[PDB]
């Protein structure tokens, strides 16, 4: 039985004959939408996916240092300049050094020096975006067997088939629903995250724009490259080592994400729907009424929403048969007061002692639940608020 132990539930009602209900849908919830002379129905939004996530940025957290130079000049000799200065794959740093008869200069003073180095990326982590075109909602529909559908904003029409109950139609999408205008899908090694735009755009590491192709073009390369202590013609260059833990410590919070495979699952939903169930058919109002008896194999327990779950066991060859199940204040005799959530219930196992669960919505105050008809019928008292 669905929505039995589910916390975030919502037993929203429906119209009988007119097939239009307001169905809000959240991630990891339930919407028990019953109806007319049609089987009660559970619509649950389970998954939210996003494929084709375009790369917004990539930060290098472990850099590699490559071929490096050092052009120096004597004082009053002008400024220095290297080959690969204008080269975008190189990071450089100009400075002035002590020059004299010691180094190899005739004059004493401050001589020019420029040092360059080629940049590489050992490991980079990537931030991807989330468009409403990406988003895709896998949704489960059960008889309260259960078919699963998928609504892509590019095709918001679905139709599921469930056993001898016919079919359920579905039509949704509320334009920009739970809109992830902000929020980036940040994948590091193999672990993923959902971080905020601003926090991502302000990360103290080298970075390039879109994907790759033929060598990116990291910016702010001197975030992982430090020019240390010149000499006259030689100034040193150092990389800062891998920065995995430095990121890990900063990302101890962000709402983690899972995926499989390349499709990224996110825990969020919201989706307004308008579905039609004309092709819904109970099953068979041609089943004969159950003649035998029952048993409270589980004591009539209350839900948190006010409804009552009830468990019976049928000792009869008679099945498949319709279960006589109702409620009454009169008891003599003997009309119904409340309603069935599990509307028009049916035992389908043939022999022998066949169990079944039921959900019912009792009237305010004292009422008695009745399972079976006439002789050997079960009754149980129940109060409501």
């Amino acid at each position: 039985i669905r929505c039995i132990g589910v916390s975030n539930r919502d037993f929203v009602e429906g119209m009988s004959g007119g097939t239009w209900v307001d169905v809000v849908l959240e991630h990891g919830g339930c919407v028990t939408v019953m109806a007319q002379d049609k089987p009660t129905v559970d619509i649950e939004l389970v998954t939210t996916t996003v494929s084709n996530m375009a790369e917004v940025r990539s930060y290098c957290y472990e850099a590699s240092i490559s071929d490096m130079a050092s052009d120096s000049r004597c004082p009053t000799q002008g400024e220095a300049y290297l080959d690969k200065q204008s080269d975008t794959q190189y990071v450089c740093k100009r400075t002035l050094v002590d020059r004299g008869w010691g180094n190899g200069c005739g004059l004493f003073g401050k001589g020019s020096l420029v040092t360059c180095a080629k940049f590489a990326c050992s490991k980079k982590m990537t931030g991807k975006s989330i468009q409403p075109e990406n988003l895709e909602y896998r949704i489960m529909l059960s008889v309260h067997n259960r078919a699963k559908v998928e609504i892509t904003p590019n095709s918001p029409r679905a139709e599921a088939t469930l056993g001898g109950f016919g079919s359920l139609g579905l039509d949704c999408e509320p334009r920009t629903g739970l809109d992830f205008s902000d929020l980036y899908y940040l994948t590091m090694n193999n672990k993923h995250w959902l971080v905020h735009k601003e926090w991502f755009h302000d990360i103290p590491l080298p970075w390039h724009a879109g994907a790759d192709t033929g060598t990116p073009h990291w910016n702010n390369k001197e975030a992982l490259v430090e020019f240390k202590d010149a000499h006259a013609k030689r100034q040193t260059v150092v990389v800062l080592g891998s920065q995995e833990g430095a990121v890990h410590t900063a990302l101890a919070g962000a709402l983690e994400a899972e995926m499989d495979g390349a499709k990224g699952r996110l825990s969020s939903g919201h989706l307004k729907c308008r579905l039609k169930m004309d092709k819904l058919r109970l099953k068979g109002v041609s089943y004969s009424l159950c003649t035998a008896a029952f048993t409270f194999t589980k004591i009539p327990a209350e839900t948190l929403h006010g409804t009552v779950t009830v468990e019976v066991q049928y000792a009869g060859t008679d099945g498949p048969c319709k279960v006589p199940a109702q409620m009454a204040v009169d008891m003599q005799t003997l009309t119904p007061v409340g309603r069935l959530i599990t509307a028009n219930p049916v035992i389908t196992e043939s022999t022998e002692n066949s169990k079944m669960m039921l959900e019912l919505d009792p009237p305010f105050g004292d009422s008695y639940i009745v399972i079976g008809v006439g002789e050997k019928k079960i009754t149980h008292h129940w109060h409501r608020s």
Partner: antibody
Amino acid sequence: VQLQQSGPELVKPGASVKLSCKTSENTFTEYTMHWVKQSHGKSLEWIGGIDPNNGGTNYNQKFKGKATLTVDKSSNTAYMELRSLTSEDSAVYYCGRRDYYALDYWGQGTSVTVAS
Amino acid sequence: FDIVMTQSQKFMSTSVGDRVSITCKASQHVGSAVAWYQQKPGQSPTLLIHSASNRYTGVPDRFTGSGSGTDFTLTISNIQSEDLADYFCQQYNSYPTFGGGTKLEIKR
């Protein structure tokens, strides 16, 4: 001695004097000219230098204003001009040339006597 | 700033065939940017050692330079008559400065 310096000088106190030093008997302009004062008590003292290419000077702070080094490229003739002289400017002025190391080659010096 | 080069010995005596060691003490670190200069009386100074221990052309191996950091010693072995002169040190790490000078006297 690859360096010919000017002859001695007698200068009246106050007056200015220009000393000369000449070099280079081959096309090798990558060297430098420097000037060194030797006062009595045989104490040496670096006055300043000059690149004969661009003309890059470089004076000892002690001799800023007092000395002015200028170069004549084509003749390979370096010049050092003193000004507003006193008796404590009276000394032997050597000129030196750096090619590889420190003061690699010295002239015989120019004796400067500042007196009325 | 300026860098003081100190030679404690104003004078120093020796005879032919002996060994003398003049000491130059820089007040500040000048590494190996030190030169030495011989000046015979009447003549002009000449380069002997440079780089602090490497001797200049013509100079016999009797003349040995050494030292680093702040202290440098010019050592003359098998001293001859013609060796009498003034000996100067000179840092060229910063603005050139010379030592006070050390006169080598010969005894006989």
